[PDB]
């Protein structure tokens, strides 16, 4: 009847071949595996919500927005008195690297970098401005602009 | 083996004309007599390789 | 016994 | 006796390249899980 | 893989 | 990756023609499906009053 | 002083909350009021070692 | 039981 | 850190 | 002496597609406001 | 600079 | 003087923000008020060498 | 010694179906009355 | 010497089982009210 | 340990 | 853990 | 790839 | 697998 | 002119 | 290091 | 780090 | 007799 | 702890 | 391929 | 399987 | 001595496509405003 005993020890080996020590071994191995896969190269961008004054006179450099691959950056458009400026429309350069969403009435442009460091620019004409607003969008910086309170030079339909 | 275009590790996008044949892009050659002429027989002595 | 470092650290022989 | 060292070199040589093929099948698989970007979803409320 | 975990 | 264009497009053509026959067949059968469902559907119960 | 704790930590940035409810994100080298400057951000263990010797860890009530 | 558990525990915390 | 289900007495 | 030609093949296949990623230009879009 | 999941003791 | 911090930097151009709120763009060689002219722009480490030995870095509270 | 593998095979064909029964989970059903 | 590689194949095929269970994460469900 | 520049820099032997 | 990490860190910092 | 990153 | 189960 | 990505200490 | 003219100009050995 | 950058920069500017 | 931990612990011979 | 179904007398 | 670039 | 069944 | 003809063949494949692109001219467009 030890025939039976050796059969059974043998296949407590075979059917379930990882003694439960080995199964938590593999669980932890995979844990570290895709924790390493989850690791970011270097320090990630600092999440900052900034505010900038937009200067539209000739000779001024355009506002520059820090982005990051796969992160939302929201641009809100504000007049000199701090009231919202609804957007007329926008035209983004190279949207194969950037993805922009906007509900068609509001004044919030939410942009993600679909590529790591490929930068571009974006024009946005507003309700009250004949001249639109330029912004150069650079991803992969040491900071990520979660939101930019850009302060347009003019006075909008809200005063 | 590296000579055979069918065994070219690269894609066959280069010269499809310069190849000597479908089995070798360059011929190995034929023995020649000591005159630079084609040595088709042994009795005509072959010394060089043209 | 196996840790969360992935390295195996085992007790030797004891009883209770 | 240089021959036996030569085929000893032969014997413990295949390991680097089969390990190599294994790591490529791993690494290309990784890098494509890297090249993805999930388009972000706007949900407008009621 | 540390021991202070 | 060890491919060339000629049988690539030939194979694409064979698959695409297959699904073409499939969808054309689907349309032809679906006309019959639709008119049979129509003739039966003239005969099925319907509730008119807005209150149950 | 103000004793901070970690709400979260990853390789690189780490988010800390002080006793005043303030929130701060730090990198490998950055100044912390009172604590000095971080030398190391131990993400997996959830520790951070800073210059003047203190080790910041998860709050006892949060971990 | 517990003896093996805490022995392997201190062995893991000592050998990092 | 201990996973006692990998237990050996 | 074969290493030179095999490696030239590997990154000629590389350089072709790097150039192809370079030649692409994705056209801007116009979204027009309500 | 240091990813200590790339850590060895 | 007026303190600048590199707002964001790529190989070549680097956009700077000052303590006055001014924004600027600089290349490998470009004049800066007070700092002189830029000797180098390292985008990898977010650092710029100018002639006066002054080192332009990312601002502490944004990097 | 062949008995070793034959007994292992037969009680393998058993143990596999026993574990398959053990994973079986038949969900609860909620009955509503009039 | 063959035993190590055969059991290698068996609990590789088992380890793949385990890891693909781990990668599985099911979407949540919502039931509203009347 | 491996840096961001891609070059591998590691310590030799340490413990706590 | 920490001391090996700091040793590797300073080794990477000193070797550019 | 420098050591002051 | 302990005996105090 | 300098591409430090092609940099080497 | 490489220039924009296409010709490669590199330093020899410089550590920081 | 930087020293190689300056050296290669001046080498490229000197050898045109 | 077999326990829940998976290890077998069995009596030798006892009758009633 | 005891599964007495496996009763050996 | 100039040097004053 | 005992004798007091 | 095969090098010259081989590289010249690569040159034909390049230069023919170059001259073909330079032969290309596309028609201008006229957008009449509303």
TrEMBL record, chain A:
Protein name, UniProt field: IcmK (DotH)
Shown segment, full-protein numbering: 105 to 263 of 361
From TrEMBL, chain B:
Protein name as annotated: DotA
Protein encoded by which gene: dotA
From TrEMBL, chain D:
Protein family (similarity comment): Belongs to the TrbI/VirB10 family.
Portion held of the full protein: 779 to 824 of 1048
Compartments, record wording: Membrane
Superkingdom field: Bacteria
Protein name stated in the entry: IcmE (DotG)
Automatic annotation (TrEMBL), chains G, L:
Superkingdom assignment: Bacteria
Entry protein name: IcmG (DotF)
Species of provenance: Legionella pneumophila subsp. pneumophila (strain Philadelphia 1 / ATCC 33152 / DSM 7513)
Residues of the full protein shown: 207 to 269 of 269
